[PDB]
Structure formats: C-alpha cells, structure tokens
C-alpha cells in the first residue's frame with residue numbers, strides 16, 4: 001500500500017480479506033460478490 | 039457566496055446557500071409540534 | 086443538456102441515481118453519455134464493467150493517453166466514461182493529480198458543442214477539488230442529492246450548492262418520526278426541493294450487486310418508476 | 326489512547342458514533358476529549374453547541390488565534406474541540422487551509438503526553454487531505470465505519486485503510502436479502518471486522534435532532550447498549566499506546 005515533520009508515520013494497506021472457502025448461493029445471486037471472490 | 043473561475047474554458051461557477059424560507063412555519067400546527075420535539079429544527083427556524 | 090449530480094454528503098445514493106437516470110432517459114428515447122467524475126470510480130460497476138478493468142478518462146489522462154479512447158458503449162443510446170482506477174499512492178495524494186486533469190473540460194466542451202449526445206450526466210464527488218469545480222462549471226443544470234435526516238438538514242443551512250441546483254430526496258423510508266418531521270418542514274421551507282422523491286427500495290440495493298442500473302435490473306421496481314418521474318421532469322425542465 | 330474514527334464512505338454514521346462512544350467512555354469514568362477534524366463541523370451539534378457558535382480549533386488557527394481557547398466542557402469528564410465554521414470561500418478552497426493546520430499535531434501530542442485525558446477521540450473526514458493524514462498518524466488505534474451494502478463491499482477491495490484499523494458495522498438491520506448476503510460473506514472473509522455491530526435505531530436518527538449523544542438521549546436504546554459494548558471493548562483492547 002502507501003506509507004504517510006514530527007516523528008510519526010501512518011501505513012495504509014487494503015483490508016485483510018480471506019476468500020479461502022451456504023455462501024455459494026450468495027455468490028450465484030450477485031455477480032458483484034462472485035467477482036471479488038474468484 | 040463564492041464564484042469559481044475556470045479560465046481553461048472561460049466559464050464561471052457560482053455557489054450559494056440553498057434557498058430556505060421559514061416565514062410561514064407558524065401557520066401549520068403539525069410543524070409547531072415537530073419544532074417543539076426537536077431543538078435542532080427550532081434552532082434554524084427561529085433564525 | 087449537461088446535468089451534474091452531486092451528493093450534499095457522501096453515501097446518499099448519487100451514483101446509483103446517476104446510473105438509473107441515464108437508463109431512464111434512454112428508455113424515453115434519448116442519447117446519453119454518463120461520465121464518472123468521482124475518484125472512487127464506482128459508476129462503471131452499475132454497467133457490468135469488470136472490476137479489474139482499470140481504464141478511464143482520468144487514468145488515461147494521467148498516463149499521457151487520449152481520454153476519448155476510454156469510453157464504453159453500453160447500449161446504442163447509452164455511452165459510459167469511467168474515471169479509471171487509481172493506485173493507492175494516487176488515492177492518498179490527490180494533490181499530485183487533481184490539478185492535472187483540466188483537459189477534460191475542453192474535451193467535454195467540444196462534445197457539448199458537437200451535439201453528439203442529447204444528455205451528458207456527470208456523477209460528481211462530494212469534494213471541492215479544482216477538477217470537481219471545473220466539471221460543475223460545464224453543467225447546464227445540477228441535482229443535489231439528499232437523504233431526509235438531521236445531517237443533511239444542517240448541511241443545507243451551511244454549505245453552498247451550485248447555483249440553480251434542485252434538491253432530490255433519496256432513501257425515504259417508513260418508520261422514522263424525525264424523518265417525517267424534517268420532511269414536513271422541508272415541504273414548507275426548502276424552495277429548491279423537487280416535487281418527487283425516491284424511497285429506500287431493495288431494488289436500489291440489489292441493482293449494484295447485479296451490476297445493472299435499477300430500471301434494467303427491475304423494470305417494475307417502485308424505485309424505477311420514481312426515477313422515471315425524475316427523468317420526465319428533467320426532459321420538461323432541464324432540456325434547454 | 327488516541328482513537329481515530331473514519332468512515333469508509335461518507336454518511337455511514339461516523340460522527341454520531343464518535344459522540345456516542347465519547348459519552349459511553351465518560352460514563353465509564355474515563356476523562357475524554359473529542360476532536361472534530363471534519364471541515365463540516367457537525368460533531369459539536371451532538372453536544373448542544375449553538376449552530377451560530379463559530380469558534381473551533383481550525384477556525385482559531387486560521388484566524389491567527391490560540392486553538393487552546395476553542396475547547397468546550399460538556400461534563401466534568403467530557404471536553405469538546407469543534408472544528409469551527411468555515412466561510413463558503415474557505416469551504417470551496419480546501420487547498421488554501423488544508424496545509425496550514427499542522428500545528429494542531431504537536432498541540433495534541435503535548436495534550437496526550439500530559440495525561441489529562443484517558444481517551445482522545447478524533448472524528449476524521451472521508452478524505453485524503455494533508456491534515457487528515459497528519460491527525461491519523463497521531464492515533465494509537467482507529468475504527469473504520471461501514472454500512473453493509475454493495476458500495477462499502479467494493480470500497481473494502483480497492484481503498485486503503487489505516488494499518489491496524491478494525492471495521493465497525495453501523496446501520497445494520499436484518500431482512501434485506503442482499504445485505505444479509507454481504508454480511509454473511511463478511512463474517513467469513515473480513516479478517517478485521519469487530520465482533521459487535523450497531524443496529525439501525527431511531528434513537529441514532531433522533532439524537533442529533535435532540536442535540537445529544539445517543540446514550541444521553543435514550544440510555545435504554547439498543548444502539549446505546551451496543552455503543553457501551555464498544556466502549557468496553559475499547560477499554561480492553563485499545564488502551565495501549567503506539
């Protein structure tokens with residue numbers, strides 16, 4: 001991701017998301033959700 | 039109260055506060071009760 | 086006509102409404118270009134553009150390419166111009182590029198003059214950046230999107246709107262006395278309030294997940310009919 | 326600890342949650358300072374500050390004045406630092422002042438070192454300005470506020486969050502099929518989601534219109550109880566310094 005006078009930094013990264021493995025019906029219903037899960 | 043100048047196409051964009059009229063609020067009793075329920079609404083309408 | 090749509094605050098439904106209104110205008114027989122001016126680049130996802138598709142007018146412009154080659158044709162009547170995907174470094178340093186995009190203004194002015202499109206709708210972000218102001222200046226008319234809540238109420242007494250903008254309610258719901266009270270007060274006081282509104286409607290929540298405009302996703306959704314009322318008003322009042 | 330709260334998108338509940346969480350922490354005996362870092366200057370209205378009261382830390386700073394005189398006492402354990410009211414010209418020219426506010430950082434860092442407050446909460450706007458990044462860097466922990474909808478779902482796959490942020494759901498209400506699908510998917514996949522959420526609650530819609538934090542407005546509201554669960558979690562997990 002990205003890392004931002006005084007001795008302080010702030011790191012930025014994408015959120016930690018785990019699509020490792022019910023929800024199969026949710027992914028078939030919504031192509032937007034299936035898109036990120038593949 | 040601001041006019042943005044867009045010299046690159048010679049256009050201007052004016053901005054202003056939305057047009058709000060509280061002059062006739064006192065006439066409807068339905069609004070008088072709502073103004074009594076919510077101090078935030080009363081605050082803007084009193085002004 | 087060039088029509089800007091801008092939320093009075095974030096999250097009020099501006100992008101979904103832009104996509105829905107473009108679809109409605111097409112159903113009424115109009116030629117429409119829909120332009121995403123938001124760095125979040127979300128409008129394209131209502132038109133089945135792959136998330137991994139990174140092209141867009143601003144992405145092209147920052148890369149030294151022709152922005153006019155980033156356009157997409159959705160139907161014969163509806164064209165789309167995504168913003169493009171920014172890197173995280175670009176996302177977190179808007180000062181690096183938010184003044185490098187002026188060329189889009191001359192390009193849209195040329196498109197306006199050509200009469201190629203009957204409507205150009207611009208999804209504008211809730212910021213005050215140079216590029217947002219520049220795009221606003223190109224609009225013939227603008228809609229300011231609100232929800233009926235205490236936050237939008239306050240904002241309407243303290244933040245400027247584009248001159249001549251009309252106010253459009255989205256997300257109106259059942260079950261809220263304070264909303265009903267604010268709404269009744271607005272009906273008597275808010276001189277710029279449009280006479281039609283959009284309810285909270287499951288079709289408007291589902292249609293983005295289905296990657297379609299609401300009126301394509303569910304043509305008989307109550308919200309699709311509310312958007313059509315808006316479209317008809319725009320044809321009558323915003324045409325020129 | 327300094328705790329930042331920032332919406333993943335605008336309008337998700339960040340300011341109402343900041344006011345409510347500050348109230349809950351002070352209910353638990355903590356001395357709290359709540360700082361409004363948003364140029365819209367809305368936080369003060371949850372604490373019965375008159376709309377025409379224009380003073381604030383950034384207002385005073387842009388006027389060549391001492392930001393330390395812009396503070397307000399709500400209770401003996403809750404102080405408020407409003408942003409101040411900007412003119413329309415200042416609102417539409419954020420580049421003019423967004424770079425002239427960095428001295429608030431050493432002022433807050435000094436206020437932190439003094440130990441006067443057990444918690445400093447900062448309501449952060451949904452932007453990437455210099456001052457937002459600066460104030461974010463002062464935070465020991467941060468919460469990223471979401472609503473369960475397709476827009477927030479997309480944002481979590483494309484925008485950076487502050488490192489170490491936890492995600493807090495607000496405005497939750499069961500019965501929407503797509504929202505329940507997204508939520509069940511987040512439960513299995515979003516590794517930094519908090520274990521509690523905040524339901525849609527009319528107390529949260531009303532409290533701003535009553536100009537109070539939700540727990541003062543309706544202590545027995547479900548949302549007020551959920552914010553108290555959040556405050557207890559913060560005492561347990563976020564009291565360490567960075």
Ligand SMILES: Nc1ncnc2c1ncn2[C@@H]1O[C@H](COP(=O)(O)OP(=O)(O)OP(=O)(O)O)[C@@H](O)[C@H]1O
Pocket residue numbers: 092094095096097098099100101102123125127255256257283284285286287289290291292293308334335474475476477
């Ligand atoms: N009337 C409505 N009923 C139900 N859900 C809605 C409605 N309008 C919008 N939504 C949902 O609310 C979320 C936010 O909508 P949208 O992306 O259009 O808002 P926005 O104002 O463009 O947000 P942003 O600040 O991110 O630009 C989306 O998930 C959308 O599907």
Ligand SMILES: Nc1ncnc2c1ncn2[C@@H]1O[C@H](COP(=O)(O)OP(=O)(O)OP(=O)(O)O)[C@@H](O)[C@H]1O
Pocket residue numbers: 094095234235236237332334335336337338339340341342363365367451495496497523524525526527529530531532533548
């Ligand atoms: N859990 C909730 N239940 C019901 N209404 C809520 C809830 N949370 C917030 N609201 C309402 O939503 C509106 C927006 O809330 P708020 O001002 O806290 O959001 P925000 O994310 O800080 O907005 P902004 O982007 O303007 O800073 C308010 O009118 C508030 O009363």
Ligand SMILES: [Mg+2]
Pocket residue numbers: 099100101123127
């Ligand atoms: Mg949008």
Ligand SMILES: [Mg+2]
Pocket residue numbers: 339340341363367
């Ligand atoms: Mg806020």
